[PDB]
Design a protein around this nucleic acid. Sequence first.
RNA 1: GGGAGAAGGCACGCUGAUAUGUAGGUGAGGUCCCUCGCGGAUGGAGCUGAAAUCAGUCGAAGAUACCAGCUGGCUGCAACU
Length: 416
Amino acid sequence: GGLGELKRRLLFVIGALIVFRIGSFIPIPGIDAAVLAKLLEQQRGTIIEMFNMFSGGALSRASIFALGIMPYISASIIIQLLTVVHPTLAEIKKEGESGRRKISQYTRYGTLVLAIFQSIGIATGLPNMPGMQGLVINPGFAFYFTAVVSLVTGTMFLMWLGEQITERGIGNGISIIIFAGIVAGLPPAIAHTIEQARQGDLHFLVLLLVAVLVFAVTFFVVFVERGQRRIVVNYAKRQQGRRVYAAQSTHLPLKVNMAGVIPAIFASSIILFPATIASWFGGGTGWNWLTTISLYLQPGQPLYVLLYASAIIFFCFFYTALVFNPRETADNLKKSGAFVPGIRPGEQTAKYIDKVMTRLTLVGALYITFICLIPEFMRDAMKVPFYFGGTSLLIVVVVIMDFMAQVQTLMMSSQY
RNA sequence: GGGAGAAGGCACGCUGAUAUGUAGGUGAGGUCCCUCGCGGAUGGAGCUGAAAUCAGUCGAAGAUACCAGCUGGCUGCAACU
């Protein structure tokens, strides 16, 4: 706040959020958001609620972003999938950053194609199914083309905003946009909670217990994320071997979390994808089957909570194992002549680190599972609104902690 | 040539550093050359590894056991194995 350098970046990010907000408050022409918002009040609109949380609340308002930034993440999932399966992309990836720019371009183009396909499916399928129940506009090719091009331009401009915040400002664009979109719904929730509290509909003690529990979860997950296991190693004697004296790290820190919201968003996309594709048909055979299997996975249902929990565990474990590389560490200790008591340098050192991280990231994922599990049972028992949900809290905490970590990192780098 | 191992004396363990194993010994990967091979040069990862010096430490005793010359002076005879 004091430094002007970070101040300009802050004003840039905030301003970007302003532009994004104004752009998100503009509904699609020929679409009434009132009947849509009225439709979400039923049980058939509860299944799309979880998908609405990642749209920044622009889904109910029928803004220029239908799916939000989700198709970009899904596009990244598809790109990584083709990278794992097809060796052709893997070869290009090994050609250096020059091929990484190609993977980039193909990821953006894939995002474009997915945006087009999803625009077509959504706009054509759901409204025109009854048809013309929610929309007055006739099911013609004009409305189709209009909706397609509109959602394409919207998603493209959104990606542009994501690139601008990432480049000309601190932190990730997608991260801060999703974060802002999530925390934007908190003040109306609190306001409506207070207004209904004086009506006798909601008890004050309940809200107090909710707030206290939220603060407790906060303090807890903050305490956990900064928790780490350090490996003590004393090296080295005999100063004329051209390695010592260090003047280096006397201990190797090991963090439970990376940390990032990427596994959470990815897992969210993966789990919600079958729920998203089945939510396009409200009536007909979709009501008899697709709507049923859409009710199979619900934020209020324990099954979806357990499945999403397992997804969180798997994605977080895989990501944590992917980011941290014991090879580079072992090579770093080898070139410096570090000898671990405990050990002998080689491949045996890499197996030890993996052995520790396997017993670490596991119980860490168990902790995250618990933290994600509590607010659902709290929502069932205390009847708290959906803005207090566990996923949103996790996203907020991760985003804030990681952003502040990056800030302190930049301040430490600029210091010495 | 010998006599001579003459006689007589000195250090000797362990641990650390000089060097997280040195001097040497071996010689991978790589790059180059080739009359292209079980080739040549470069190359130094890994592996092996004395000796010494300095500092410390235990014990009455460090060639701690088994192992492993008694030595010197005069003379007879036979040169010698």
